[PDB]
Structures are given as C-alpha cells and as structure tokens.
Design a protein around this ligand. Structure first.
Ligand SMILES: CC(=O)N[C@H]1[C@H](O[C@H]2[C@@H](O)[C@@H](CO)O[C@H](O[C@@H]3[C@H](O)[C@@H](O)[C@H](O[C@H]4[C@H](O)[C@@H](O)[C@H](O)O[C@@H]4CO)O[C@@H]3CO)[C@@H]2O)O[C@H](CO)[C@H](O)[C@@H]1O[C@@H]1O[C@H](CO)[C@H](O)[C@H](O)[C@H]1O
Ligand SMILES: *[C@@H]1O[C@H](CO[C@@H]2O[C@@H](C)[C@@H](O)[C@@H](O)[C@@H]2O)[C@@H](O[C@@H]2O[C@H](CO)[C@@H](O)[C@H](O)[C@H]2NC(C)=O)[C@H](O)[C@H]1NC(C)=O
Ligand SMILES: *[C@@H]1O[C@H](CO)[C@@H](O[C@@H]2O[C@H](CO)[C@@H](O)[C@H](O)[C@H]2NC(C)=O)[C@H](O)[C@H]1NC(C)=O
Ligand code: UDP
Ligand code: MN
Length: 267
C-alpha cells in the first residue's frame, strides 16, 4: 500500500476489539508519550483488546525525520506514508489510517480516529459499544448535522467556493474523535477516490459515508463526545468518551486523578 512504517502487530492472529488511530505532527512527541502513558496504553478492557497507533506523514526537517525513525524503532506503533504532514493534508493522514485498517487489520471490531489534544475514556467507550449491539455500518461521535462551510478567508477552517462549492456540509462527526465499526474502513477506502476531495478530514469522511448510505447515530442517550471541552471532575470524566482541549500535562494530571480516585463511588 506504499507504507514507510507498519506497526509490529498481527490482527489476524488476535483481532483487536478497539483500534485507536491518533493524529499528531512530527514535533508533538510529548503528546504521543502522554497518550502512550495514559489512555493509549494497550491492555485488555473487560477482556477486549485495545491497540493504539500513531499516524504520521513525512517532513522536510532531517532532524524530525531521524527523531521519528528512532521513535518508531523504539515503540513500533507508528503508521507512516510519504506525504507532507501539514494541517491541510489531514485528509491524507486520515485516509492513511483507514487504508491501514483495510489492508492490515480488517478484523478490528471498532476503530476510533482521534486527535492528540484529547482525553479518551476507553473503558466507558468499550462499555457503550458492547451495549450498542452494532457490528457493521456503524459510525458515531459528536454529530455535526447542519454545518455550513466557513467562508471567513483567514479562518483555520476556511474553504473557498472552489474548494467546496455548496451551501451545507454533509452530516459528519467532529474530527476530534469519532468511532466506526471496522468494516466501515474498507467501504470508505473503496469509495474515497470517487468522492469530491476536501481538505477537512472529518467532512471528507462524512462525504464518503453519505455516498455509502451509512447513517450517523448517537453512541448513547447522553452526550459522550465533547469537542468544546469540559470542566474536569472525576465523576464526570468517568461517564464520557472523549474530551477536547487537553494538553499533555493536563492529560497526565487527569489520568493521575482517575487513578488516585479509583475505587470511590460517584453520585
Ligand atoms: C476544534 C473543532 O471542533 N473544529 C472544527 C470546526 O468546528 C467549528 C464549526 O463547527 C463552526 C461552525 O459554526 O462552529 C464552531 O466554531 C465557531 C467559529 O466557526 C470558529 O471560527 C470560532 O473559532 C475561532 C475564531 O473564529 C477565531 O477568531 C479565534 O481566534 O479562534 C477561535 C478558536 O480557534 O469559534 C466558533 C465557536 O467555537 C466550531 O468550533 O469545524 C470545522 C469544519 O468547518 C472542522 O470540523 C473542525 O474540526 C477539525 O477539522 C480538521 C479537518 O482536517 C480535523 O478533522 C480535526 O481533527 C478537527 O478537530
Ligand atoms: C442489546 O441486546 C441486549 C441483550 O438482549 C438480547 O439480545 C439482543 C440482540 C436482542 O435480540 C434482545 O431481544 C435479546 O434479549 C439488550 O439488553 C437486554 O435487555 C434486557 C431486557 O430489556 C435486560 O434484562 C438486559 O439489559 C439485557 N438482557 C440480556 C438477556 O442480555 C440491550 O437492550 C440491547 N441494546 C440495544 C442498544 O438495543
Ligand atoms: C500534501 O502532501 C503532498 C505529498 O507530500 C504534497 O505534494 C508534494 O509537494 C511537494 C512540495 O511541498 C512537491 O515537491 C511534490 O511534487 C508534491 N507531490 C505530490 C505527489 O503532490 C502536498 O503539497 C501537500 N499538501 C499541502 C497543502 O501541503
Ligand atoms: O501538521 C499537522 C497538524 C495537526 N495535526 C494533528 O491534527 C489534529 C488537529 O489539530 P488541531 O488541534 O490544531 O486542530 P483544531 O482541533 O484546533 O481544529 C491534532 O491531533 C494535531 O496534532 C497533525 O497530525 N499534523
Ligand atoms: Mn484540536
């Protein structure tokens, strides 16, 4: 498939229950280490396997290239292809991850694409997924259903009319973190080259899902994905899946808080 780095894993032998694909730039080693030490640590969750991989492109910086080569060798959990790893190539990055699931891990029951400035509660997510009774054509997250493209020309998420010429975006889920059954990867990969390209990855996946007639659904009767962030508390964070706006030091402190308070009951 044209990959420069492949994780040392065999999904055929031991099909994972949940695969996390984490986006981060080359310089964000601190993010990746914090994740590896917290919600990214591979383990059995209620007897289900969790696997965690980091998606990277390439960079022009020789120093960063060497750093990442060393990191891959040391940890063996990086998925890499030869594309310039910049914000406006995130669509390529996401498609790389999806391509990977399709080629080397179609046995994954579920896949979460997530960002690195995130807190993820894998235990509660696994509980809600096992409760959902859905194993195919399943896609959930924070649903963004009547979105309009941002036309402010200097905005981080600006798209011109030539980049995206219609008044509304398809239904899609926030790219801060979304979850889908493993089969969905193959479908999206198959259809991706025939769907109009857009440089916003979560929107592009929404376009693919729309072409596939895959409907978005809420994971639970209460909201569980929070792209806007949250005021922290142990009891709240025990009953959410994903929270945005979390820098590495904060992630480590929050993980510590959950460990320090394990075994206490919550209202
Ligand atoms: C982080 C996030 O959720 N970003 C996604 C973005 O969300 C925004 C949209 O839904 C718009 C639509 O109304 O509302 C929200 O933001 C509005 C406004 O549009 C923003 O411009 C503004 O934020 C800026 C402000 O404009 C600046 O002046 C100021 O300096 O900074 C602030 C914050 O940076 O805020 C208001 C209220 O928050 C909402 O945040 O929607 C995008 C598509 O249009 C994307 O979905 C984007 O998500 C990221 O997209 C990339 C695409 O490659 C990846 O999927 C990332 O993983 C994903 O996080
Ligand atoms: C998911 O299913 C569970 C289990 O229910 C069984 O399997 C399902 C696929 C469906 O065919 C059910 O009719 C089966 O009974 C559901 O949780 C059950 O609900 C019962 C009664 O409401 C309750 O005692 C327990 O919660 C569960 N019982 C058993 C036998 O497991 C659950 O509601 C289903 N979830 C969704 C999202 O539909
Ligand atoms: C996304 O990545 C691609 C692949 O690296 C970039 O395309 C290359 O860009 C370099 C210069 O930046 C050229 O020398 C290559 O010829 C290009 N190759 C291909 C296959 O396109 C692309 O520029 C990146 N996108 C953005 C917005 O930076
Ligand atoms: O060149 C880049 C820029 C960003 N990102 C990742 O893409 C996600 C979105 O970045 P950011 O939080 O800046 O986007 P925002 O949520 O503010 O839209 C994050 O996990 C970044 O680490 C990446 O992999 N490569
Ligand atoms: Mn972010």
């Amino acid at each position: 498939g044209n990959f420069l780095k492949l994780p040392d894993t065999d999904c055929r032998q031991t099909p994972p229950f949940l695969v996390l694909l984490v986006t981060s730039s080359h310089k964000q080693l601190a993010e990746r280490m914090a994740i590896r030490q917290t919600w990214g640590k591979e383990r059995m969750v209620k007897g289900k396997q969790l696997k965690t991989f980091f998606l990277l492109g390439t960079t022009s910086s020789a120093a960063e290239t060497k750093e990442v080569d060393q990191e891959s060798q040391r940890h063996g959990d990086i998925i890499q292809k030869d594309f310039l790893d910049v914000y406006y190539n995130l669509t390529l990055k996401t498609m790389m991850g999806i391509e990977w699931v399709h080629r080397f891990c179609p046995q994954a029951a579920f896949v979460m694409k997530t960002d690195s400035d995130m807190f993820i509660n894998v235990d509660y997510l696994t509980e809600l997924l096992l409760k959902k009774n859905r194993t195919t054509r399943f896609f959930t997250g924070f649903l963004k259903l009547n979105e309009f493209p941002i036309r402010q020309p200097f905005s981080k998420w600006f798209v011109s009319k030539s980049e995206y010429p219609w008044d509304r975006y398809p239904p899609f889920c926030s790219g801060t973190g979304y979850v889908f059954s493993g089969d969905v990867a193959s479908q999206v990969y198959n259809v991706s080259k025939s769907v109009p390209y857009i440089k916003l990855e979560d929107v592009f996946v929404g376009l693919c899902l729309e072409r596939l007639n895959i409907r978005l659904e809420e994971l639970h009767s209460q909201p569980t994905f929070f792209p806007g962030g949250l005021r922290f508390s142990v009891c709240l964070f025990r009953r959410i899946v994903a929270c945005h706006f979390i820098k590495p030091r904060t992630l480590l402190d929050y993980w510590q808080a959950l460990e320090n308070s394990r075994g206490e009951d919550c209202p």
